[PDB]
């Protein structure tokens, strides 16, 4: 839904790296290079951001007040 | 399980249907009746069998 605060396996803070990851991928990096530029060295950290499906932007199209 | 086992051999009823024939039904007419007699080692018996 929303980016997890910590990695599940080790407790590395990964929640502050989602917008940086999207800005690196829009700047035409490879996903492996974009995960290197964030310092995600263990693949436990690296699947937390690689495989994240961000359902909150789809879930906020139904935003109620529309005002 | 339906073992065909060739033509020259025989097959009988296996498993729970045969176990039900023995126990629950005690039937006068089972599906695979059979007899089994050894023959003698006499040469006259082997020329007669």
């Amino acid at each position: 839904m929303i980016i997890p605060v910590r990695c599940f396996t080790c407790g590395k803070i990964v929640g502050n790296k989602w917008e940086a990851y999207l800005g690196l991928l829009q700047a035409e990096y490879t996903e492996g290079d974009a995960l290197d530029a964030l310092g995600l060295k263990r693949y436990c950290c690296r699947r937390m951001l690689l495989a994240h499906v961000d359902l909150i932007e789809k879930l906020l199209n139904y935003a109620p007040l529309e005002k | 399980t339906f073992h065909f086992a060739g033509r020259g051999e025989m097959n009988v009823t296996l498993g729970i249907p045969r176990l039900r024939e023995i126990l629950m039904v005690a039937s006068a007419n089972i599906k695979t009746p059979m007899m089994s007699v050894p023959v003698l080692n006499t040469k006259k018996a082997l020329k007669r069998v």
Partner: protein, 1129 residues
């Protein structure tokens, strides 16, 4: 490949770029057409049935005529329309249309409005037309009658529906209910079969007979059987209103046509000219009718109308000739509409019967998919609607009958047609079928099944929700029958039904699912040009001479119409020409035509003939015609005479005619979501299709708009790193159902043997697989709280100490609020009295209120008495919850193991799930090892790997590929790492296989399964505990437990379990006469003594200790005058 092909946009590999795309979350301008074709059978069948099939069905209802005092009155239905769902009249709204979100949240039915233009006539002249309202029929969502039709995904977001929303369902009382596709026989095709139970049907009936399932434009269905009799005579079974009638064949064949007897003779011996037994048999059948004084067609019609008028119930002023025409229209080959075509099709069915009974053709297997097709929802809807329209006319006649018996003042009908209001209203009998599934018919609708026709289409996740629209059910009568032959996977369902996707247990092999490429023919076309096209080819007409012997010819059938005969040297040319025309779309041949040419082997093979099918409801699938280079839809019977190829290498010149689109097209939509499924054992793929549908996933996007009973939500789901390409074709990252887990396969803790599994405690304490379940309880003060006076409204009496700071001023909890046990749940006050009541929360689970929606009636005039509270229960993973991988490896969590005690790798990494390696040898899920190597490579390199089956051969192995990936990442080729011990500190001597496996959390939690009963409620008949954990009841100590505890020799332990802890009652017997029924207590003057009523002596009464069910037993035997005499010593 091929332009305009529906499978040309299937991706070459899974991408992962849509998750991070800048246009993510912005709704598209158009719905993804991959998802809209999964429910296309449902929608298109309903679209036909409501627009065009309804006009054909009301043209098929005969003009209903009956008797007044003096003059015949004729009723006919000129037109019937179904209107889209709108608000009732007299309703003040800005929008007249009603949308499914209201009917889904208010728990109403999404109803259209059926109205008909009934015409009436007295004395043969039409006096006036009446537009008249009949009832409300349900509407399938996203039909041509739904109000969500033709809307873009932004407009579906505006109306609280899903973007990418397909609908094949009805909302019946707030519940999405789908009509699953039943297996019917192949329509309009003579199925020659052998059934020994037909021998017990007449005096000399054989086991041979030809069935026939005739449907007329998808609004009628009539089963009929020819039977073979040992003297070569054929009886004709036909069913009229669920009861069987047996007619000799000569009566039917002599009534249908005005032919001579010799001409009927030449049509029955037409293939087998020289078989003199058949010649004597059909001359005997023609002689049977001659012996009973029926020498013309008119005399046969007179005799048959005389014999069938009581069961048939025409008006008493029809002739007997017309009363027989009625049964030949309602009962005999109804797909034909001409009587000579009925004659020729019935002669073909008889010739196939003669070839079957003479051992010359073979039995059409009814269990093979060759001889089967599907029952679509529009067909069932339209058949039931035609039956209810006919019943409505009969109800109008009963209304005139009641007004002729009761109000017979002889008022003429001069627009006295408010008696239509006195007719039956078909809202409730129509909704009963869609609400229960039970079919209450007088015809039976040609089905062999009475129930289970509508099933709740629940939305546990999206993988389960797709499976209701792809399911093809064999029948409900077959689950009760203990035979293993309808449950076989037969090879004729290659590419049409999936081999793996079927349940386990009782519906295994019966509840089948379509493959991803398979599709149901739902289009309807005019086939008036096709027989003249065939006669432009070498097909001689059925009247003309075939210019060769009929024993060297093929019978031609076009949709159950026998067209003619083909010279067998021309018939492969005609079959190839028709396939050419079909795949090139040249001479208005439909692309869904089955051109079957069953060849003349000269051996007891299938009955030969050139069979041509264009009707709907058949299964059809795309292959590629290699001769033309274009994509062809081939059918189920057509497939068994084709040599398709799977791979490019398998194509041989002169052998293979066709080729599949892609080699994994034999599998379902759901079975194509299993990674590396050709490396797993096949029961482990059948288990994954089941438990992929039981997964706590991400069901939907509209949580506040959805009011359904339970709804399981995974909190942070992840896209799989290793998934097939069908996962991205169907955009399954809209609704992901799992999380990637660092799974290490190690025997470390003692708690993971025998299917159990270990989860890291610190991963669980971070967000791993956390969830929720949203329970929605719909509270109605009219329905439940029926005390009287009809004036209950939610509210509090102000100053009530039962609701202070715990319910709001409307007697209804706060939306942030928590609910423990015994908290006030809602309060309602009586307005005509003043007394306020409060209702308490009786569930044992602490929930948080999510939203409270308040509902009106359909008009906006309802009062504040319907409400729908939705509550969130947390449900994070505990000890005892069930997880699964994507390979059939289920497992209960045994232990939440600390992170300091978890084996850390040399990279500084613990696992978060430990897997025991003994789940591999007996189960042989090698694809889980490949998935872990592939997911580790996908994480390391930042990739997403393709796990589609059949893409790795033995030359280019999967383990070689993913080992080269891991070697390129600087890891081990074989997937193992140097783990250390978190308990010992020492490096473990073995070299432990670790990876990334995508786990699924199943909805089976121990919080819904534990129960404990100390004392409680008892059954009011037997005084034993009651059953259920929601009623807080007892568990059984049944018969086999009694047996196994007798085998221990523990007799006081049975006496405990089965007498002291169920029902230890104390009865009073008379010791003299031995009777429980005889003692009786004295009416008081104290004393309290008993008297035996029999012997009138108070001395002989003493207590024994019996079960209470023994007292119930002796009372129920006394009800049959059976005396139970006790020996009490």
């Amino acid at each position: 490949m091929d332009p305009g092909s529906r499978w040309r946009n299937l991706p070459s590999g899974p991408s992962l770029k849509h998750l991070t795309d800048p246009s993510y979350g912005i709704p598209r301008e158009q719905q993804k057409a991959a998802l809209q074709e999964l429910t296309r059978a449902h929608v298109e069948s309903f679209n036909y049935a409501v627009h065009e099939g309804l006009g054909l069905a009301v043209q098929a209802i005969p003009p209903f005529e009956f008797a007044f005092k003096d003059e015949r009155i004729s009723f006919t239905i000129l037109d019937a329309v179904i209107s889209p769902p709108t608000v009732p009249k007299g309703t003040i709204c800005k929008e007249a249309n009603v949308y499914p979100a209201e009917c889904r949240g208010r728990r109403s039915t999404y109803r259209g409005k059926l109205t008909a233009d009934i015409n009436w006539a007295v004395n043969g002249i039409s006096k006036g037309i009446i537009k008249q309202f009949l009832g409300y029929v349900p509407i399938m969502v996203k039909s041509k009658l739904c109000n969500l039709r033709n809307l873009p995904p932004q407009a579906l977001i505006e109306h609280h529906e899903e973007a990418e929303e397909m609908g094949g369902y009805f909302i019946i009382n707030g519940i999405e209910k789908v009509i699953r596709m039943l297996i019917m026989p192949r329509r309009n095709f003579p199925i020659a079969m052998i059934r020994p139970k037909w021998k017990t049907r007449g005096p000399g009936y054989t086991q041979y007979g030809v069935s026939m399932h005739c449907v007329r434009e998808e609004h009628s269905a009539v089963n009929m059987n020819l039977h073979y009799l040992e003297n070569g005579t054929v009886m004709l079974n036909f069913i009229y209103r669920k009861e069987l009638f047996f007619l000799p064949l000569g009566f039917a064949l002599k009534a249908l046509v005005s032919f001579s007897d010799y001409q009927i003779f030449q049509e029955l011996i037409k293939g087998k000219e020289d078989d003199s037994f058949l010649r004597n048999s059909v001359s005997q059948m023609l002689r049977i009718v001659m012996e009973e004084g029926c020498s013309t067609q008119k005399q046969v019609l007179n005799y048959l109308g005389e014999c069938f008028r009581v069961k048939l119930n025409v008006p008493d002023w029809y002739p007997n000739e017309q009363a027989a025409e009625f049964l030949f229209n309602q009962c005999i080959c109804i797909h034909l509409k001409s009587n000579t075509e009925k004659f020729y099709m019935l002669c073909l069915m008889t010739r196939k019967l003669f070839a079957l009974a003479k051992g010359e053709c073979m039995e059409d297997n009814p269990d093979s998919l060759v001889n089967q097709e599907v029952l679509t929802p529009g067909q069932l809807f339209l058949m039931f609607l035609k039956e209810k329209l006919e019943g409505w006319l009969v109800s109008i006649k009963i209304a005139f009958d009641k007004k002729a018996q009761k109000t017979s003042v002889s008022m003429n009908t001069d627009n006295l047609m408010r008696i239509f209001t006195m007719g039956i209203d078909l809202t409730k009998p129509f909704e009963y079928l869609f609400a229960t599934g039970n079919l209450r018919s007088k015809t039976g609708l040609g089905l062999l099944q009475d129930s289970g026709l509508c099933v709740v289409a629940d939305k546990l996740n999206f993988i389960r929700y797709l499976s209701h629209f792809r399911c093809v059910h064999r029948g409900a009568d077959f689950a009760k029958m203990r035979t293993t032959t309808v449950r076989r996977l037969l090879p004729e369902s290659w590419g049409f039904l999936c081999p793996v996707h079927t349940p386990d247990g009782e519906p295994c092999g019966l509840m089948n699912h379509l493959t991803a490429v398979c599709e149901v023919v739902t289009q309807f076309v005019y086939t008036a040009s096709i027989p003249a096209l065939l006669c432009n080819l070498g097909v001689t007409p059925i009247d003309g001479a075939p210019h060769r012997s009929y024993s060297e010819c093929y019978p031609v059938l076009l949709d159950g119409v026998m067209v003619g005969w083909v010279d067998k040297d021309l018939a492969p040319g005609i079959a190839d020409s028709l396939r050419h025309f079909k795949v090139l779309r040249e001479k208005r041949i439909p692309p869904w035509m089955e051109v079957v040419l069953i060849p003349m082997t000269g051996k007891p093979s299938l009955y030969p003939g050139l069979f041509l099918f264009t009707t709907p409801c058949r299964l059809v699938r795309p292959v590629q015609n290699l001769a033309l280079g274009k994509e062809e839809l081939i059918g189920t019977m057509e497939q068994i005479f084709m040599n398709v190829a799977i791979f490019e290498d398998e194509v041989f010149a002169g052998v293979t005619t066709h080729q599949e689109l892609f080699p994994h097209s034999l599998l379902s939509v759901i079975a194509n979501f299993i990674p590396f499924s050709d490396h797993n054992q096949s029961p482990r793929n059948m288990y994954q299709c089941q438990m992929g549908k039981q997964t706590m996933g991400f069901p939907l996007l509209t949580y506040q708009d959805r009011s359904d009973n339970k709804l399981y939500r995974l909190q942070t789901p992840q896209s799989p790193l290793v998934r097939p390409s069908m996962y991205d074709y169907y955009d399954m990252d809209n609704y992901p159902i799992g999380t990637n887990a660092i799974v290490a396969v190690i025997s470390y803790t003692g708690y993971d043997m025998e299917d159990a599994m270990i989860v890291n405690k610190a991963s669980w304490e971070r967000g791993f697989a956390h969830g929720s379940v949203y329970k929605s309880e719909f509270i109605d003060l009219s329905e439940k709280i029926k005390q009287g006076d009809s004036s209950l409204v939610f509210g509090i009496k102000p100053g009530d100490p039962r609701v202070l700071q715990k319910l709001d001023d409307d007697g209804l909890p706060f939306i942030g609020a928590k609910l423990q046990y015994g908290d006030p749940y809602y309060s309602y006050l009586n307005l005509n009295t003043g007394e306020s009541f409060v209702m308490y929360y009786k569930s044992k689970e602490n929930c948080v209120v999510d939203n409270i929606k308040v509902c009106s009636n359909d008009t906006g005039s309802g009062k504040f008495k319907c409400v729908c509270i939705t509550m969130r229960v947390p449900r994070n993973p505990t000890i005892g919850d069930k997880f699964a991988s994507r390979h059939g490896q289920k497992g209960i969590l045994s232990r939440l193991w600390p992170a300091e005690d978890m084996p850390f790798t040399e990279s500084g990494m613990v696992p978060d799930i430990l897997f025991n390696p003994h789940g591999f040898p007996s189960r042989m899920t090698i694809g889980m090892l490949i998935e872990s190597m592939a997911g580790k490579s996908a994480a390391l390199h930042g990739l997403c790997h393709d796990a589609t089956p059949f893409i790795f051969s033995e030359e280019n192995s999967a383990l070689e590929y993913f080992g080269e990936m891991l070697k390129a990442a600087g890891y081990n080729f074989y997937g193992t790492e140097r783990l250390y011990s978190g308990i010992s500190g020492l490096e473990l001597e073995a070299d432990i296989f670790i990876g990334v496996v995508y786990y699924q959390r199943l909805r089976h939690m121990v919080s819904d399964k534990f129960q404990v009963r100390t004392t409680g409620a008892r059954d009011r008949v037997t005084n034993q505990p009651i059953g259920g954990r929601n009623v807080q009841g007892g568990i059984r100590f049944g018969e086999m437990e009694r047996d196994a505890l007798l085998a221990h020799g523990t007799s006081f332990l049975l006496h405990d379990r089965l007498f002291n802890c169920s029902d230890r009652s104390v009865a009073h017997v008379c010791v003299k006469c031995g009777s429980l029924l005889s003692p009786l207590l004295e009416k008081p003057p104290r004393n309290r003594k008993y008297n035996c009523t029999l012997c009138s002596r108070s001395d002989t009464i003493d207590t024994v200790s019996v079960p209470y069910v023994f007292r119930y037993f002796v009372a129920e035997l006394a009800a049959m005058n059976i005396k139970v005499k006790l020996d009490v010593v």
